[PDB]
Amino acid sequence: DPFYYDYETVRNGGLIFAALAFIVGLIIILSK
Amino acid sequence: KERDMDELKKEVSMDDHKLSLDELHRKYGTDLSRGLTPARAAEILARDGPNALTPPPTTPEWVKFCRQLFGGFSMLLWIGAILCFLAYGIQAATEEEPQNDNLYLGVVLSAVVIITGCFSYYQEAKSSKIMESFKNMVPQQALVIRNGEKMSINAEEVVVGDLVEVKGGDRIPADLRIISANGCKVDNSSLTGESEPQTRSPDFTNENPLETRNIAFFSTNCVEGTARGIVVYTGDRTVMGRIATLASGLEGGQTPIAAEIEHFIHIITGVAVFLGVSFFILSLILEYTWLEAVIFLIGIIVANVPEGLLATVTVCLTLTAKRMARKNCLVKNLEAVETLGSTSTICSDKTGTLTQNRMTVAHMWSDNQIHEADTTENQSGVSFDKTSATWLALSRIAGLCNRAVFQANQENLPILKRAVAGDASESALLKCIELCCGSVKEMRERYTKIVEIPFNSTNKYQLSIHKNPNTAEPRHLLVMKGAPERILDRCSSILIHGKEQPLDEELKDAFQNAYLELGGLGERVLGFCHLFLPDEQFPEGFQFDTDDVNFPLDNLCFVGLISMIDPPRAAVPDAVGKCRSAGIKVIMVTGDHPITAKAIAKGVGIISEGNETVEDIAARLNIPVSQVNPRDAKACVVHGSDLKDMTSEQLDDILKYHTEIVFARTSPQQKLIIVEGCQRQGAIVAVTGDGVNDSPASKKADIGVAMGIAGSDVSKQAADMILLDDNFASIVTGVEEGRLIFDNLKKSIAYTLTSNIPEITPFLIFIIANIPLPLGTVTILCIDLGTDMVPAISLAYEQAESDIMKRQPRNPKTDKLVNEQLISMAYGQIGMIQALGGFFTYFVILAENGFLPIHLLGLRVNWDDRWINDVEDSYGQQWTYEQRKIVEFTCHTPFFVTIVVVQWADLVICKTRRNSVFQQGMKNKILIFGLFEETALAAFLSYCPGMGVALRMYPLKPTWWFCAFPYSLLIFVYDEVRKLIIRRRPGGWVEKETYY
Amino acid sequence: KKFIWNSEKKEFLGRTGGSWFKILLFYVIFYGCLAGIFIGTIQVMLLTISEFKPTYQDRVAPPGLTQIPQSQKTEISFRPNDPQSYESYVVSIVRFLEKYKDLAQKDDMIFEDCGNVPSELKERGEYNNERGERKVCRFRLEWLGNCSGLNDETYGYKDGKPCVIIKLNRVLGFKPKPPKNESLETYPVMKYNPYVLPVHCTGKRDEDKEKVGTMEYFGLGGYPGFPLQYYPYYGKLLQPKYLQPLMAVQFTNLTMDTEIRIECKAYGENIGYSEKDRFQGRFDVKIEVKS
Ligand SMILES: *[C@@H]1O[C@H](CO)[C@@H](O[C@@H]2O[C@H](CO)[C@@H](O)[C@H](O)[C@H]2NC(C)=O)[C@H](O)[C@H]1NC(C)=O
Ligand SMILES: *[C@@H]1O[C@H](CO)[C@@H](O[C@@H]2O[C@H](CO)[C@@H](O)[C@H](O)[C@H]2NC(C)=O)[C@H](O)[C@H]1NC(C)=O
Ligand SMILES: CC(C)CCC[C@@H](C)[C@H]1CC[C@H]2[C@@H]3CC=C4C[C@@H](O)CC[C@]4(C)[C@H]3CC[C@]12C
Ligand SMILES: CC(C)CCC[C@@H](C)[C@H]1CC[C@H]2[C@@H]3CC=C4C[C@@H](O)CC[C@]4(C)[C@H]3CC[C@]12C
Ligand SMILES: CC(C)CCC[C@@H](C)[C@H]1CC[C@H]2[C@@H]3CC=C4C[C@@H](O)CC[C@]4(C)[C@H]3CC[C@]12C
Ligand SMILES: C[C@]12CC/C(=N\OCCN)C[C@@H]1C(=O)C[C@@H]1[C@@H]2CC[C@]2(C)C(=O)CC[C@@H]12
Ligand SMILES: *[C@@H]1O[C@H](CO)[C@@H](O)[C@H](O)[C@H]1NC(C)=O
Ligand SMILES: [Mg+2]
Ligand SMILES: [Mg+2]
Ligand code: NA
């Protein structure tokens, strides 16, 4: 039905993005 | 009535020193050779208080904590929190099922001020926590004569009117009236500022108690010799005591950074109340009643207050303060880190601050040639030619015939900073031979001394005979030293490259002009000579008993002169050049003699080479000084003898027409008056001192800069910034970081002030167009107290766009921290694009879910209603309360995301005020992380399991993250081309209206 | 320092006249461009949506269940004697049913007589505009027995034993699916399970269920629900003056002078519920006929 949205998949992608972008920012401020 | 008490301290001190010995003993009832009975001593002890300055006024820790919770900026957040509970008081009692947003907001604002107070208090208290680790107050017992016997007692156990004896090395306890001295030289450096060790003689000399020698002073040390004195002043009544008490009782003033904070709020609230009131009138004109319009007034004003700006500003100041601590330049005040950048006139102290306050060998005379010795504190200067017989002979005369040696623990310390016992002159000679001529230990015991002749009260000469252990000549070596006028009479031979010559006037007059060269340079000159005694007339067994003529006073062989003076610190001259380059008027303020003050000012940069004084012009023309025009002299020397008989207007005229000023022989009180005169010009003044005379000048100054080790404790506490390393170049570092953080604060301020427009416009048109709420409260807090925290703080790590040490000091009345240009950009243009971008995402989500943007007009009337569970949209569908409220909350979450999207470009453009982003470059690694954290955190606040449950922030359909993309790109384009036109057109339009 | 108003050298409110004109002209042009840009982008946004269907329809997955007396707190408190006490209710009921009169549904070009018996769903092609304006099945007030009457301009309703009709939230393209014949304990209901969306009312706890004595339902042909012959909806643009099905509920044996809670739960597979939205699928009411 067109009345069902795959919110769990979009939500899953949003958290994975929040994980990648954040850890990469940590790598950014850690120039070693 | 404390006003009169302060006026009795700003006055120059008075005394009763000039009295006969019998008169002083009668007035004090004290025996001159015995002192007094111990019972009489204890009677005064329990009468006026022990001889010690009253402790500073203790500052309890709860007082300064509540101090950090107040101020000027935190006061704004306090009145805002009060308005939140006031609005909630009207809201709770008047509407149904009231919302917990205003109460949530009131407590959050209160929490913001409290956490900011705890963080800032932890930093200011940390500065004091390390400052208390510097109080190495070692108890020092004084030698007092009572009941005819000598006794050593604590300095506090000393009272008024009793004989006190001091040994060469003992620190003078209280203020004494010398009665009998024997070659006693005291060090008045830490008090009046007299550099060379001023001797103390019982005979009354000058009307001023400071210049006279019959007075020993508090906190002064006896350099050499011994002396007796009657205690005249004790405790706080002492000289330095009245100076210290004056410093504690002086005002601190209003820091320039705090004044910028006050002017900042003057505009923040000016527009907040303007928007709130004008909209309050508009709301009542429409339909909202007094009940609701009052809440509208408070909401519009309260939202216009940057809540997260307090914490970001405090951390922004804290970061620069951290760098100050890294370079051993501690700031006792968290905001005093900025005061250096705003400084336009630095009042420096000569002895101790600019100079090292230590006699050092300056120049040498050899072969009718001047040889400058290295006078740097760290020994990093030019080394003279040390490969000649004239040098070895001169060095032996100084290293051998000199009553000066090292001490016990002086073995691992450097050659200069180590301790030496004896005269300051003999100490300088020892430090130069131990550094440029090997070691004086073995060089002294080599030539065995037979009979010595120390200095004399008249015809001051110091000679001694030594054995010659050379493997060629067994003749005795006689050496002598003294003033050039006292040795020229006892000389006939002259040493040159090894051989001797007569006293020919061709080289003897060449010696006189060189003596006048070192003397005119403000240094103390001495003359060294030696002669080979004929062993045929004085055999190896003949004992030269010191009574009659055993040594030829005349016919000696002169080698050369040796001058000495306290040299300026290593990085002092270069630092003075940097400050004058920055446009800061350097003014020397000291109580030292003018003869040396003028020379030191010439050597540091306060007096430019070529400029003449009012006196110099007259001497150049062989005319009286009263004829020359003071306008012809760019520089001028001001003696304290003339400063006492001056008015405020006269001092103003001295500062206006003379660019290079040197105040010499100025009393500590006159130091205060000099600083007050510079403050009358409205310019920011910084005082750099060390002695107790700098306490009243550093306290009243906008910022006091003290020396961490070579500075007295009083002026060290009255100051606002301490240099633990005593590196005067820290002043240049301070002015650089001060202007740096000032402009960086402008950028960080414009960033937080830009987000304000898209934060309030949703609630504004919510009242006008009667549309559903475009942006919620909790979502706004996620921006002002969440995501934007990192970009705002990362904006502090920005570097210089151009050379900051090249621009002139900022005018206080002209260059304001927040002006109409910054607001024209933040509230007027950049924030405006952010607001429209938010409304774009708002209409996008609603229209895609069935609520056309045109259909949302006047919908909030039934939208916000909780029981109308059938509201027709644009397609005819019926939405319940939660079904549409879920859409509103999932419309606030992407609106928040929309803010982060436009904040990307807003951060990149605010990063550079004038240069292009391609010029400045995205090298700010903290800013890069500011974008990554802000973006990832924003996604976390929408897609975490339970955000729509706790923060009412529902997940976003992936297409919303791009609804705001063109707005950010547009903001970047418009601001980039704006700064580009500022580059190619530095005239007026894009610079006077947009550049801030 | 705050009297910078004017001077003989031309300044007003802080700046000169020529400067005021330059700034005002710049801001007018700047904000004009900003307005034009926002309008152009909002126009592109309007071009990304159609006229016959909303792009996102997942936020209305479980349809609501509303009533005719849109009470301030879903409570019905009145006096069986005082006519002004229940005026706010009757006014809303008459205004709601004003579009269901036999005179309102008179044009045969936009109305279609569905039938006296609930039948299967009526799909009128696709949702595009290739077809003309679709027809809307008629629904005369006579279907709601004992809660319609043949009254005058004012529908003299029930003073004692009031009437509360229920309505299913109109959703575009929504096809109601009643529960299977394997009904999982659905409270005595008629055997017309295939062509009508059942709706059953009840109390809320052991107290409300006892106070509410007898309830009488009224619908199309006598079934307590909504007939499938009226679905799906094709939007307001293609189906204006559409009349969604109605079903009345009367509470005969009530305990006067006592506030009792009633929960009218609509059952079906395509009908969801929500613990946060008490209107999604279910429906609540607080009736109190205080005499
Ligand atoms: C509608 O209301 C009428 C009353 O006007 C009800 O008619 C009564 O019905 C009962 C049987 O249930 C008879 O015993 C009475 O004699 C009837 N009275 C009248 C005046 O007709 C009717 O039952 C109601 N309809 C429904 C479906 O409940
Ligand atoms: C309608 O409700 C009334 C209660 O209000 C029922 O009558 C009561 O029955 C009990 C016994 O169970 C008696 O104690 C009461 O005195 C009765 N009251 C009245 C007013 O009669 C009645 O049975 C119910 N009728 C229907 C058709 O449900
Ligand atoms: C201007 C450019 C360089 C910035 C780079 C960041 C852009 C490309 C990133 C930042 C945030 C990102 C979004 C983060 C969250 C979501 C939800 C996820 O379930 C699908 C991807 C999606 C929709 C991302 C698309 C790409 C995005 C918009
Ligand atoms: C809700 C709606 C109607 C409010 C409309 C407010 C608009 C018209 C207001 C809000 C902020 C205002 C600007 C604020 C800043 C500047 C710079 C100043 O040096 C002159 C006024 C000027 C140029 C204003 C022009 C008018 C302006 C853009
Ligand atoms: C309507 C808008 C999008 C078009 C505006 C054109 C923009 C995108 C173009 C015009 C001029 C271009 C710049 C020209 C100069 C420089 C400096 C160089 O060292 C790197 C490329 C760089 C940084 C270019 C980047 C892209 C640029 C800014
Ligand atoms: C608290 C509020 C006004 C009161 C309110 N509901 O009042 C109806 C109670 N029945 C909720 C509103 C919000 O959530 C949003 C609030 C707004 C006041 C002004 C606020 C605090 C702002 O500047 C941004 C958010 C705005
Ligand atoms: C449901 O089952 C009953 C008997 O249990 C039967 O009478 C009725 O016709 C059935 N309905 C359908 C739609 O199968
Ligand atoms: Mg804000
Ligand atoms: Mg000093
Ligand atoms: Na101060």
Side-chain angles (χ1 to χ4, degrees), chain B residues 158-214:
Chain B
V158 187
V159 300
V160 200
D162 51 330
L163 179 56
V164 168
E165 177 178 318
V166 285
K167 179 173 56 65
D170 300 347
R171 174 174 165 273
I172 298 293
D175 296 341
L176 310 186
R177 212 298 198 180
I178 304 302
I179 63 168
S180 63
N182 172 61
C184 172
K185 285 184 175 295
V186 86
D187 181 48
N188 300 320
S189 171
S190 186
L191 225 169
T192 183
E194 286 168 328
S195 168
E196 34 186 323
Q198 300 286 297
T199 168
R200 300 288 95 167
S201 68
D203 290 78
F204 148 78
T205 53
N206 198 313
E207 285 282 316
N208 198 327
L210 311 173
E211 312 183 17
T212 185
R213 301 177 173 174
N214 57 6

Side-chain angles (χ1 to χ4, degrees), chain C residues 22-282:
Chain C
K22 292 181 178 185
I23 296 183
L24 266 51
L25 169 135
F26 160 78
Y27 266 77
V28 161
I29 292 296
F30 182 82
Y31 283 47
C33 299
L34 280 192
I37 292 166
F38 179 74
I39 285 171
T41 64
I42 215 72
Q43 282 315 308
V44 179
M45 182 271 282
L46 286 185
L47 298 177
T48 45
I49 326 170
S50 81
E51 334 173 24
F52 332 101
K53 176 175 293 178
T55 36
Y56 291 112
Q57 309 181 57
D58 62 86
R59 285 311 187 185
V60 255
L65 209 61
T66 56
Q67 76 287 49
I68 18 133
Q70 289 287 311
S71 157
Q72 180 72 285
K73 296 168 190 179
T74 66
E75 52 189 14
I76 298 94
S77 187
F78 62 98
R79 180 193 292 273
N81 306 110
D82 188 53
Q84 192 67 26
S85 179
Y86 55 78
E87 268 282 319
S88 53
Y89 301 88
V90 187
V91 157
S92 293
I93 322 310
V94 181
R95 290 191 298 100
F96 182 95
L97 280 78
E98 199 53 44
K99 58 195 175 182
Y100 288 86
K101 294 184 168 174
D102 280 53
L103 264 299
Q105 334 163 27
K106 212 170 180 291
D107 200 331
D108 296 323
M109 283 297 300
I110 44 186
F111 289 103
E112 172 188 13
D113 251 296
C114 248
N116 279 32
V117 47
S119 63
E120 59 212 315
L121 302 94
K122 307 196 58 169
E123 198 166 14
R124 299 165 189 82
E126 297 172 1
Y127 303 102
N128 53 30
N129 206 23
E130 299 179 351
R131 272 201 205 174
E133 200 180 72
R134 327 284 168 154
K135 289 186 181 299
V136 165
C137 262
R138 308 167 177 267
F139 192 65
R140 316 187 308 277
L141 328 99
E142 301 141 69
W143 299 122
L144 296 195
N146 290 77
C147 297
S148 294
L150 218 289
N151 289 256
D152 298 79
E153 50 199 345
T154 160
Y155 280 74
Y157 265 106
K158 277 63 249 169
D159 19 76
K161 303 77 224 58
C163 284
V164 171
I165 101 185
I166 324 184
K167 177 191 53 171
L168 178 63
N169 271 18
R170 188 175 23 184
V171 182
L172 203 161
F174 179 56
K175 301 183 191 302
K177 295 184 187 179
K180 219 174 190 176
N181 211 19
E182 179 249 355
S183 1
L184 242 63
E185 201 84 68
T186 57
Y187 281 101
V189 68
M190 213 64 259
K191 69 124 76 276
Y192 212 101
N193 68 98
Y195 300 124
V196 67
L197 208 55
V199 172
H200 200 295
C201 302
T202 174
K204 287 194 65 61
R205 58 190 179 275
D206 186 70
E207 161 191 330
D208 300 320
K209 290 178 183 183
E210 187 174 5
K211 297 278 189 178
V212 187
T214 304
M215 305 171 296
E216 275 189 324
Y217 305 147
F218 314 105
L220 199 294
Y223 302 115
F226 304 106
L228 270 57
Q229 39 181 5
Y230 292 96
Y231 291 102
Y233 186 50
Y234 281 59
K236 179 173 62 180
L237 187 146
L238 291 182
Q239 280 179 332
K241 302 176 180 181
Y242 171 78
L243 302 167
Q244 69 259 280
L246 301 173
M247 169 209 47
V249 173
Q250 178 195 348
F251 305 93
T252 40
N253 211 331
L254 292 187
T255 303
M256 289 194 179
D257 301 73
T258 295
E259 183 175 350
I260 61 201
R261 309 181 177 187
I262 278 293
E263 168 158 6
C264 291
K265 189 173 172 185
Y267 302 98
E269 319 207 18
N270 288 18
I271 291 83
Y273 307 97
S274 169
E275 289 292 338
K276 224 63 169 51
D277 192 342
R278 281 139 283 180
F279 285 85
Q280 281 189 2
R282 41 194 198 181

Side-chain angles (χ1 to χ4, degrees), chain B residues 287-345:
Chain B
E287 55 171 325
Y288 310 96
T289 180
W290 314 83
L291 138 65
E292 299 168 313
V294 166
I295 320 294
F296 288 142
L297 168 77
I298 294 181
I300 295 161
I301 299 174
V302 166
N304 199 81
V305 177
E307 335 91 60
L309 194 44
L310 172 62
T312 57
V313 162
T314 299
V315 177
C316 200
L317 287 164
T318 311
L319 291 172
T320 308
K322 295 279 186 174
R323 287 191 301 272
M324 306 292 265
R326 301 169 190 175
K327 303 184 182 63
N328 304 281
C329 177
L330 172 129
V331 278
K332 287 211 294 292
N333 188 11
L334 185 59
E335 37 172 35
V337 61
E338 186 280 330
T339 321
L340 290 318
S342 304
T343 309
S344 52
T345 292

Side-chain angles (χ1 to χ4, degrees), chain B residues 239-399:
Chain B
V239 182
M240 73 91 65
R242 288 187 288 182
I243 299 168
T245 314
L246 176 58
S248 297
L250 286 178
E251 297 282 56
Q254 185 183 29
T255 46
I257 172 64
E260 301 303 325
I261 293 184
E262 197 168 17
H263 184 249
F264 162 82
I265 304 177
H266 283 178
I267 302 304
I268 293 303
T269 53
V271 300
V273 306
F274 177 78
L275 296 181
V277 166
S278 48
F279 260 70
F280 174 85
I281 270 73
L282 208 162
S283 63
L284 285 175
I285 287 299
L286 311 178
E287 55 171 325
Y288 310 96
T289 180
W290 314 83
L291 138 65
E292 299 168 313
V294 166
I295 320 294
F296 288 142
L297 168 77
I298 294 181
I300 295 161
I301 299 174
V302 166
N304 199 81
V305 177
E307 335 91 60
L309 194 44
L310 172 62
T312 57
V313 162
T314 299
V315 177
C316 200
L317 287 164
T318 311
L319 291 172
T320 308
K322 295 279 186 174
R323 287 191 301 272
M324 306 292 265
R326 301 169 190 175
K327 303 184 182 63
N328 304 281
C329 177
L330 172 129
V331 278
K332 287 211 294 292
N333 188 11
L334 185 59
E335 37 172 35
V337 61
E338 186 280 330
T339 321
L340 290 318
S342 304
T343 309
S344 52
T345 292
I346 292 177
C347 299
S348 185
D349 173 59
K350 175 192 137 51
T351 298
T353 307
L354 289 181
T355 69
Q356 304 169 6
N357 188 17
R358 179 187 59 86
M359 212 63 59
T360 312
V361 176
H363 304 73
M364 297 166 295
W365 199 77
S366 299
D367 314 86
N368 197 31
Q369 182 174 327
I370 305 289
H371 314 288
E372 46 176 324
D374 191 10
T375 61
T376 45
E377 49 177 340
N378 54 327
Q379 277 304 309
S380 58
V382 60
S383 300
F384 55 93
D385 187 46
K386 46 187 62 59
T387 47
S388 179
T390 315
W391 152 254
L392 290 178
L394 187 67
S395 66
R396 286 183 307 172
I397 304 164

Side-chain angles (χ1 to χ4, degrees), chain B residues 779-798:
Chain B
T779 60
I780 295 182
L781 295 185
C782 302
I783 285 295
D784 288 289
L785 303 171
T787 68
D788 283 4
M789 297 298 295
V790 208
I793 292 309
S794 76
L795 219 40
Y797 286 100
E798 270 308 309

Side-chain angles (χ1 to χ4, degrees), chain B residues 699-714:
Chain B
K699 186 63 165 297
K700 193 63 178 181
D702 301 333
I703 174 172
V705 196
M707 317 306 283
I709 46 177
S712 65
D713 294 72
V714 179

